[PDB]
């Protein structure tokens, strides 16, 4: 069982920047190492085979090098459509083993999120549960902070978050924060607000709603 140590697990670079991924083998595997690109929601696609050779159709900006234990995967001029997770894999030694994977993010200018708050619908209140949703529209970078304060009381442990992938035509992210509580707790309070902190906002923006 050969261990594949891929590094780094994440990287950010602007369009046209040079990007290099390392992958160290625990044994000598000669040149029998492949590189796969997996875009979100799609299957992995083999880009580089036998350490250096390019698969059919792969643009020239992709390159691979190495022999023995150390190998490198390099994108010359990074393109936005190259946002994906890249995996190194040895092929000759059974069983074939993959690397941890590297997430590649394109870098762009800061974009503040458009924030929206969504009260629980009347149809869901009969289900005995209230769901409040805070939406952070297309923003960059992904690093944001969403806090729930109802009746000016901060909450924790009763909210979940979801983040989309980097857009293809925007290179931005979208976050959702969902605060879930019972109907009794919902009608026992009045003011509902989420507070969002993000680079590109001068101060934490607050969106609020009152029952009525």
């Amino acid at each position: 069982d050969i261990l594949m140590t891929q590094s780094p697990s994440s990287l950010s670079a602007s369009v046209g920047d040079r990007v290099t991924i390392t992958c160290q083998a625990s044994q000598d595997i000669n040149k029998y190492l492949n590189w796969y690109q997996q875009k979100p929601g799609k299957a992995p696609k083999l880009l580089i085979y036998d350490a250096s050779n390019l698969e059919t159709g792969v643009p020239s900006r992709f390159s691979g090098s190495g022999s023995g234990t150390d190998f490198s995967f390099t994108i010359s001029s990074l393109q936005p459509e190259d946002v994906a997770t890249y995996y190194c894999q040895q092929s000759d030694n059974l069983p074939p083993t993959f690397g941890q994977g590297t997430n590649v993010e394109i870098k762009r200018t800061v974009a503040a999120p458009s924030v929206f708050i969504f009260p629980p619908s009347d149809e869901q209140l009969k289900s005995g549960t209230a769901s409040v949703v805070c939406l952070l529209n297309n923003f960059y970078p992904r690093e944001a902070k969403v806090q729930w304060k109802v009746d000016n009381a901060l909450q924790s442990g009763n909210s979940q978050e979801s983040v989309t992938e980097q857009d293809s035509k925007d290179s931005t992210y979208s976050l959702s924060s969902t605060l879930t509580l019972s109907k009794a707790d919902y009608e026992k309070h009045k003011v509902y607000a989420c507070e969002v902190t993000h680079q590109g906002l001068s101060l934490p923006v607050t969106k609020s709603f009152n029952r009525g």
Binding site: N34, Y36, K42, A43, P44, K45, L46, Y49, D50, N53, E55, T56, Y87, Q89, S91, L94, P95, P96, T97, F98, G99, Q100, G101, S114, F116, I117, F118, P120, S121, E123, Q124, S127, S131, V133, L135, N137, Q160, E161, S162, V163, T164, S174, S176, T178, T180, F209
Partner: protein, 218 residues
């Protein structure tokens, strides 16, 4: 043209069985060695098994004694028979032909296998209406919440595929109750609110098809 197509995945019970099939078009499965790879939700890739042209089969230690790779040359189809299924077997399964030191790698799109004792639950589609504070000329956000469903996945479209720009369907989040939840939002002009019909269509593994209209509150 040249493609590999997986099928047979689904939601089974722990200890149950399953038969995955991989149909090859443009590749003679008898001439190359075929591989089964799997990827857990949000994790990396793990080699499962391989079968050679000569008929030799190899298996990962974690599935040895439970999984069996075979192929029917007359049907040009690879098979993976999975028995004694466990929870850690839940993954997307791909078949692949990576040519040895040549060009022509092909992976199928995969098939999702979920192993859990939980039953399928249809979701509840609730509205997230456009804010009454939306000022004309600007952009307003609306969406629908798809809550309490098992297992993955759900399909959300807008206006039967007519509305695609400005749509964000978030990945599903596993709630503390074990059921998944999901939200799909879309940004539209504050004008044409009440002049354009905004409807979100939700589909699921249980036969749930919700075609829900989003309107201002009162």
């Amino acid at each position: 043209e040249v493609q590999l197509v997986e099928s047979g995945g689904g939601l089974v019970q722990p200890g149950g069985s399953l038969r995955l099939s991989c149909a090859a078009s443009g590749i003679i499965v008898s001439r190359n060695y075929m591989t089964w790879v799997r990827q857990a939700p949000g994790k990396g890739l793990e080699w499962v098994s391989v079968i050679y042209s000569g008929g030799t089969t190899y298996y990962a230690d974690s599935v040895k004694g439970r999984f069996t790779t075979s192929r029917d040359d007359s049907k040009n189809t690879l098979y993976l028979q999975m028995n004694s299924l466990r929870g850690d077997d839940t993954a997307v399964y791909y078949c692949a032909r990576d040519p040895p030191h040549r060009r022509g790698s092909y992976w199928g799109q995969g098939t999702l296998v979920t192993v859990s004792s939980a039953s399928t639950k249809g979701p509840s589609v609730f509205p997230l209406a456009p804010s009454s504070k939306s000022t004309s000329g600007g952009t307003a956000a609306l969406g629908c919440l798809v809550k309490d469903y098992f297992p993955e996945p759900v399909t959300v479209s807008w206006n039967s595929g007519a509305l695609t720009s400005g749509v964000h369907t978030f990945p599903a989040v596993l709630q503390s109750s074990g059921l998944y939840s999901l939200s799909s939002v879309v940004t539209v002009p504050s004008s044409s609110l009440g002049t354009q019909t905004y409807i979100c269509n939700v589909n699921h593994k249980p036969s749930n098809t919700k075609v829900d209209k989003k309107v201002e509150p009162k």
